From Swiss-Prot:
Organism the protein comes from: Homo sapiens
Enzyme Commission number(s): 3.1.2.-, 3.5.1.-, 3.5.1.124
Protein name per its UniProtKB record: Parkinson disease protein 7
Reaction equation(s) it catalyzes: N(omega)-(1-hydroxy-2-oxopropyl)-L-arginyl-[protein] + H2O = lactate + L-arginyl-[protein] + H(+); N(6)-(1-hydroxy-2-oxopropyl)-L-lysyl-[protein] + H2O = lactate + L-lysyl-[protein] + H(+); S-(1-hydroxy-2-oxopropyl)-L-cysteinyl-[protein] + H2O = lactate + L-cysteinyl-[protein] + H(+); N(omega)-(1-hydroxy-2-oxoethyl)-L-arginyl-[protein] + H2O = L-arginyl-[protein] + glycolate + H(+)
Gene3D superfamilies from the UniProt entry: 3.40.50.880
Organism ancestry: Eukaryota, Metazoa, Chordata, Craniata, Vertebrata
Annotated family: Belongs to the peptidase C56 family.
Length: 185
């Protein structure tokens, strides 16, 4: 049974964190919502407050994940980009050859941690310049971009496609389709 690690830092975009967690869980994949700052509730960009399942501190110890997903939100992505814990996890996930997914401003975290340089990726239009600084990536405008183990999406309204892509990547076309239907997309 596939496992997903979702890192939630304050400033994180609510819709971008909940949609993938919800979706992935609908797909029978064990999702762990780890609060970047601990086990305390996290205040997201639009003030909705989420209680983490656990702190990154603990979650990190729970062996590897088939997918580690980075939510968007300017500030949230900044918090991640400045976190040493996230740096070690992303790097482990890239050596271990696992999947890394980031939506909206979230991929600018792969940049800060030098993850997957050379991959084709996408971001929120307004996060393109930051993500492209230094030309270490090749930009794309598709709603969902997947270059090997690097899966990126653009924003809130691409979350469903983002999340379903992860599902397909982890459990295949059949499961993603079954999960998708009831969603009324």
């Amino acid at each position: 049974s596939k496992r997903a690690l979702v890192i939630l830092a304050k400033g994180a975009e609510e819709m971008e964190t909940v949609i993938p967690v919800d979706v992935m869980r609908r797909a029978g994949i064990k999702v762990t919502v780890a609060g970047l700052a601990g086990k305390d509730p996290v205040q997201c960009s639009r003030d909705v407050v989420i209680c983490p399942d656990a702190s990154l501190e603990d979650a990190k110890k729970e062996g590897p994940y088939d997918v580690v997903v980075l939510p968007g939100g300017n500030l949230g992505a900044q918090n991640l980009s400045e976190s040493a814990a996230v740096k070690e996890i992303l790097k482990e996930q890239e050596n271990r050859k696992g999947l890394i997914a980031a939506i909206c401003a979230g991929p600018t975290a792969l940049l800060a941690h030098e993850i997957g340089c050379g991959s084709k990726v996408t971001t929120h239009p307004l996060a393109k310049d930051k993500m492209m600084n230094g030309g270490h990536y090749t930009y794309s405008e598709n709603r969902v971009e997947k270059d090997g183990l690097i899966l990126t999406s653009r924003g809130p309204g691409t979350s469903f496609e983002f999340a379903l892509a992860i599902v397909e990547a982890l459990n295949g076309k059949e499961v993603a389709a079954q999960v998708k239907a009831p969603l009324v997309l």
